[model samples]
Target: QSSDICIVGAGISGLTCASHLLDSPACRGLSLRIFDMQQEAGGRIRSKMLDGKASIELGAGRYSPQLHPHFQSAMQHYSQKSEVYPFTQLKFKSHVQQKLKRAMNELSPRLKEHGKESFLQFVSRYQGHDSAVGMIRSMGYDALFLPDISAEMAYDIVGKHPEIQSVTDNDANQWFAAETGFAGLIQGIKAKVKAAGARFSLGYRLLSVRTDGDGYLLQLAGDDGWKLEHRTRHLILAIPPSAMAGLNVDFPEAWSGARYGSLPLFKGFLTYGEPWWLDYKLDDQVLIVDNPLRKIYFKGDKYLFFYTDSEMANYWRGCVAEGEDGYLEQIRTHLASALGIVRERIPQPLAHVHKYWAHGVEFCRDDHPSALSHRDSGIIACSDAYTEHCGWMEGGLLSAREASRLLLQRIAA
Candidate 1:
């Protein structure tokens, strides 16, 4: 009914801000209410636990602690010092690893000298080597992107992660995953926020957000009917920008300018009885092959993540109707092409689940800044879009923390 602050979207950003505000000294007297459309608290950091197996993350499964400073700080705050495992990339097979290290080490210092170089342009600087170009363009820039399409975004699809200076490309690239499918991170934070007396209302869809007099009005819709939820001194939208279009809310001019592009990613998890990948590389963490699928992650030797983007996403989705019985076949075909395995040899999954994020953390160039604060009704929008963490959990965490810090500052003043 009423709150000192009302936060929308109970995802990572919303929950993180709530936790921070509730824990901070300045937030001592503020009553908070959180609303979300989904029944669960974890948004993009989702994992499905099925058939008594290790949970497979359907949204954000991977994180690099060595590369993500904010993520490290958050993990430390919760005392979540679990040792996460790294991916065993095939390209870096000893000698090739040394080659990549030498190449990136040599070219790393010169990257800033080029100034906003395209993906292809950056690779071209390291001439006479197809190995480095193949990894950077295909792995970094895109394997699912259109050909001759570096100009599509007008920049190299990156502001840089962990930022220049060869950000941890030294050995095996070191891609790590949560010991508990990453939902644990959210679950941990959600518990803290709730313990701090934050009220959360799930399945509450926001139709619009408007100001009346001194407080804000939330035109909310749920399974029952449309209703008005109101009275908050401050409001925050932690959802993606594309979601705002459907909110029917009169957001600020900044909201109008808040644009984000998508990669049409389809990351779904499938399970098999035995570890089929063991025959090839027992340490096999990822499989980047030529086909409809851009990449596949073999997590815990059971769950498999089918990742790809752009036209190929739609093409393959249409090939199998996305979730139909045909979907399994299309994936089988693509998996065969990628793993060099026969279609029949590939085992049918025992159980599976997936989620397709429309916006899917689109490309944005930034110096890894905070969320955008707008003058329209003093609204401060929080999303990975405003941050340069490439839309990982790190972006959401960093942006959300900064957004909350700003609110704390204003209240203290």
Candidate 2:
């Protein structure tokens, strides 16, 4: 059939746009259609149960309240009754910060001696030093402190480089350090979208988009070799950059594929079992790993940990390889060393789960030097890729909301 809006890549961006459009008077009674490659909804905001006792997120484990205003607003609008838990309130330690400080201290003398240089210059000068590179890689410091890592580790086991930016001009890494997870936010939006009578074609992949007169036609591939063609007046692309790259699109050669293609992304391991924080006797707070292998956050009694090591496999292999007992053992070994908690006291997590994110690019201050481009086209580009706040959920929501408003105005005018 046909619709007023046809959204591609049902990640947060597309979903946010759809949700807002439904709420807007301009889009009243307008038909909206969403197409996603994945079999399920909530692109990066995915969660699964281990044993019906705990849930683990595969992508976007946590975000900071200070950075995600759009996310907060969405929650208030849709899932206000659902608990908006804080990443800091969870009982956990700030071991990640300590590790980062220790690592930085080792480099302080060298950084001071070098006078001043761009992050790329710093990486080139110290490329041969393993310890320095290790430190930089651990905290995804290269994206913030050094040059891009795509020049080397394209297929190495570390998934991809970490290059996400924060909403503000300050350290993007620190911005993520202060946020909450996207589970609740996704749930809130999903509920509202469904309530608005929008159709979600989950598990369906977009095969092609062809221009049809004033609108565009979408060819989607699904089970039983079923090809569905959908026509709509407008389209919104909201998947991560990497996923966006995978789409078969014809763009002019001038398009900077390197800049967008080279954007750093990675899949992280998240473990959720019995509340691991209660045993540590700590209040709500997250423990970040300056090392490449670990990031821990406490949400109430529950604990969310992200492992960023080259050796680690996808989320499933990294955290859930061992059964509940084995997973608990692995967690104890890491947490005990990181948090000084006794192995025996650590709670047996009732479940274990993981997520992989292919679009975790870092947004440097230099990335976007001016206002966002609103080219006169139905297809709008948005994400952490276009903004300096590369990885924050708030950035994604803000970009989507702004794009939606602009599109509505354009349509009305």
Candidate 3:
């Protein structure tokens, strides 16, 4: 059977594009076939159950409320909502918190107070202690506030300093919301897609795809050397750009500008157990760290912690364990210090899982020179690497939407 569309990946982008295309009136009568290297969909959004009660997110966690257009649209389309969970609120030195608060209090007024001064300068002006100023500077606030100081100064102030001047001095809350977990969100979308007449073939890997003129032909490799092939008129490559390295397809020259081969996948440790943050009676969804285990999020009874390789490799090398037990140990140590909880108090995790993504390249404001251009032969590539907001889920969704729209237009015209 031939399909009007063939989606090459089953990740969120591919799934989302397929879902939208299936719903569009323009393609209502069309048959579609979505293929993925992974047997299940959700690409990097894998969630594993831990300790029977807690959920550990092994892949991408958290979606930003303000910028995540695709995630927001998906939630609305599926009518999904997250369960309210408690999180531990970190306590800082009273004087430091007070100073930080004062700086934040000055932001709206200060925009007027120092009309020309950037946020970093404003923060530097208000922060009296060296430690406090350093903390603020290390967070990359210079660029965020903009037009004021060198990137070096911004990094020096907020990059890795320990003493936080204020909770509100920086847009920590907004940043927190942008990095929360998406287990519930992805599950909801998965269910909705299945219900909408889309079939999923989880745990299968793709072997090859051959263009057979009328539509592309697909060959999938799975357990026991099993292979299957099918034909579809339209194809969507929705997996991360890194996954492309493993696929047997020709990438367009324009899309190959960025040395995706050099970018390492972002890996993090996650733990699932009783909610430790509940002890503090706080509900902040995200927590930023000065240490290698830089950020952690509270999702219901579980906690997902993330650390960049550069951050973890230095001070917390021991915490950078690879497998299930290693991940559990890493979480135990982080929580012991952050939450003051003993290892025994935390229930033994029902299961621990490790996740890696080779394509999670970071994107700065000026990093668009390497974006992929479409091929004349009807092949196109879509990934967050094409946008400034690359690492965030919003970027992924937006990239997917644009890619799908372009592909659809090409197929129609």
Candidate 4:
């Protein structure tokens, strides 16, 4: 089959690119087909409804009006209403929190000078490894201490992010989640795109791409064990860096010059007959713990979830490998420790859900390039990783906007 345009990866970025193209009058009548290895769209913005009562987000949950203007606008455009995401308040009381508070304040004024250095390296300059490790434990993001994470990103997470800021308590209210969750927003976008004459082919993996005269040929395989040959005048690879590395296409050869990194993420949700943590006044707040559970969020009287990244994420995966019962036992023990209670006091969950993403967030380590380009082959790559807002929907949307414009220009020529 042939298409005017073929977009690989039906995530937010690729879908947004299709939206941008359809909205433009110049790109009218162009046949667009979107492909993804996953059976469903929305990519990392996975959400599930529990008992049809509450929306539970297992991935890419929060957005900020202040930091994610593109994401904010998309939510409104899709008619997705939002409410305050209440994980803003950190409930753990520890001396490490005090040291982190002080260090962040002192580091804020001089953040620009240390953008290139690793966050751990920057901390080691003024503080020892213990304080550095303490800050990550207090932050509850093991990835913050990674050698590839820049000092600027660490400061931004601490000082600028809405959900977990080290300063200004009121700014926590700036973070919001869709009333029906991000999956709803994705559904809205997908419906609109289909209405605009775009087609989607899910469960199809683009195995290879080769130049075919003025166009390109794509070899794809479906989960149902079928193979396909697709031809498109233009190809847009809207996948992450980690996924791109798996393809046979010589990606980043003339298109990109920067390096990229990805982090693993794990999320576990436990639903109880009653809100047990509220007895300790832990409702609508986040707790940063020293255990592998890391950051735990309690949502009203419905359910609670624990989020872990980097090494701790791998730890949870290892636990799951042991057995389902073993995983639940570990969760019970960690929940008790995080709440400062006995293991016997922690009740067994009525139901539970968990997800592990080996490449939850892909980010560029340098250059902060925009859309990667290779005009001769009519191929280009766009992702959140290439932008300063890497690992965010804001960056993905922005990259899509730019990639669509570039493709439109190529079409005109």
Candidate 5:
């Protein structure tokens, strides 16, 4: 089969590209086919509904209006309702917290001087103290100290994430989450694109690509060993770098000059018969522990969840392999320690849900911009990893808009 355009990866970026292109009158006659390796369209924005009451986001959970204006606009366009996520009050207090706060305030102006250095190196060199660096890692975001994590990225994480910014003691920006969950936005967009004559082939994995005349030929393998060959004049790859490596295409040939890496993430939620955390005055507050559980959030009388990345993510995966009972036992042990309570006092959860992402956050190590050009193969690659907002939905929206503009310009020419 053949089409005017063949887009791979039906995540936010690809779906946004399709929706934008279809809305444009310049590409009115163009036919597009979308493909994704997973059955679901939303890649890193997975959410699970609990008894039609609470929406627990397993991947990306929250957004800020100030930081994510484009994402906020898209939410409004889709008519998605949201409620303020109020978990900014940091619970722990210590001298380390005070010192860390001071370090953060003084570190900003000095950041420009260490443009090429890692965050860990910059912190250690600036503070001239190992404990300060260890304090950041001990605060449960081991990803911030990762060798590939740039100094600017580390600061961005601290400022953006409410749980991590406890040192600063500022909650000027407000955070929000969709009432029906982020997946609702994905499904809404999917429905809109489908109505606009866009076709999607879920579970379709693109195996390889090759230049064919002015177009490109794609080999796709689908469910039940179903094979399909398709050709298109334009190819847009909206997947991440790690995924591109799995394809036979020689990606990064002339595309991105930056090296890429991913951070593993693990989220575990526990629901109880009663709001036990409220007894300890822990309602709607985030507690950062020095344990494997990392950052724990007590949702408003609904559920409690903990988010961890990097080494702790693998640690939780190993706990899962041991057994569910053992896995839950570890959680109970850490929960008690984080709560400053005895293990016997901690009640068992009525139900539990968890998700682990090996590549939860992907990004380019260097400061290289994302672009769509008419290469020799006539193929284009784009992802949130190439944008400043890499790990956020905002980046995906920006990437999609850029790709759509490039494609439309080519069509007009």
Candidate 6:
């Protein structure tokens, strides 16, 4: 089947573009469709399930309305209400916390002046371990603040991002967790777009895309094990850099020439019979680091969600021991160590799950000439790749806004 407009990857960027465009007077009567590789459409922003009904956020967690109008509108689109709190760990002000405090005072403003520098480069330029560079880098980059490209390549992610600086400042910022968890937002988005007549193909792999005259020729494989040809005149790639590399999008020699960074982002969720960590006075969510596990959050006292990035991320997803007990013990060691609790304080899992996004948060090579997505557009590219805060979902949404405008221009022409 053919669509007048085709959106690849139904994550935040793609879905937002689809929903808004659906409501656009200009897009009326356009044969629009969306495709994704996941079991469900919402990319990055998803919640793992318990008994397949619970929305436990495992990917792309957190949402803030005061920050981005696009995000705020998206949340309101789903009528999803979430609760907010300033993280208590921020108040803890541990030894590493002081460096973070210093970073806010020093670097937040500099991002405006040094707008073109890569985040890593800026850190080195600032010359302050006191800047808490690693701590912030370790934190938000995984949170989706943008990592695949340099800050310049990310188009001023540091200086211009919403919810990033203020939220990271730890002085007067708020952290919002979904009352319905992440699933509510995604569920509503998916439903609205479906009502708007958008069709999502789950488990469909988009293999390649090439220009077909004034339209596009897409090669895709369906779950039925049948390969099909799809055509579209307008395309929005709401996918990450790592995902982009896998698809054959032939355009802007600059696009392929551009390097989207592949950072190691790993997560682990362990469950215990009880909420044991709280007995030790550990907070609900904590970032006590310099350990293999950088941070952890306790869910209702039984679920422990731990996150690790960069080199620390390297420690996970590989077998450290042969059998299930041996391998599981390796994690037990790190969990207790990160918590600084006794081994007995750590309870063995009823069961645990893990995920590793090898190219998780993309980073760009410093030498790259353009910010990539904006370099030029024919087949437009969206996603966190084009946003300043490449790691944030807003990156995906913001880039999609720009992409939607460009797509409208193409479609109208």
What would the TM-scores of all predictions be?
Answer: 0.82, 0.68, 0.67, 0.95, 0.94, 0.80
- Model 6: per-residue Cα lDDT over 103-176, one tens digit each: 54566677677756555555555555444356455443343233333444333333333223433432333457
Q: Write the per-residue lDDT of candidate 5 for residues 47-135, one digit (tens) a residue.
A: 88765557899988888898899999999999999888877656665566566667767776877788457877777754675866656
Each prediction's Cα lDDT score? 0.66, 0.54, 0.53, 0.83, 0.82, 0.65
lDDT, model 4? 0.83
lDDT of 1 by residue, 63-171 (tens): 5656677777777777665455545344433344345445555766766676345545654567643764554433422532333334223233322221111323334
Superior candidate under TM-score, 2 versus 4 = 4
Instruction: Please identify which of the two predictions, 2 or 5, would achieve the higher TM-score against the true structure.
Output: 5
Q: How close is candidate 4 to the true structure, as a TM-score?
A: 0.95
lDDT of candidate 6 at residue 29, scale 0 to 100: 87
lDDT of 6 at 328: 78
Worst 10 residues of 3 by lDDT: 171-180
Best by lDDT: 4
Rate residue 37 of model 6 by lDDT. 72
Clashing pairs in 5: none
The number of clashing residue pairs in model 6 is 18
lDDT of 4 by residue, 248-345 (tens): 76665656766778889999988888788888888887888889898888898889989988899999999998999999999999889888898998
What is the C-alpha RMSD, rounded to one decimal, of candidate 1? 4.4
Q: In candidate 3, what are the lDDT values of residues 193-254, reduced to their tens digit?
A: 66766666655566666677856777776666677776777676666555665666655243
Q: Candidate 4, which segments miss by more than 4 Å at Cα?
A: 107-116, 125-127, 167-173
lDDT string, candidate 2, 1-413, tens digits: 78888777667777788887898988888888877777767665666653554555656555434555665556666544333334422133244323333544443466655535543344335334554444344443334343343322211111222221211113322223213345556666766787898888876777767667877788888865788888887777675555555565533122223345333333333334445566555435545444333555554664455444233334325445455566556656676666766766655554445443434443432324211322434465556555545555666777786768766875686
Which segments of model 1 are wrong by more than 4 Å? 91-117, 121-137, 140-174, 248-252, 255-258, 320-323, 363-369
Candidate 3: segments with Cα more than 4 A from true spot = 83-199, 248-252, 256-291, 296-354, 358-373
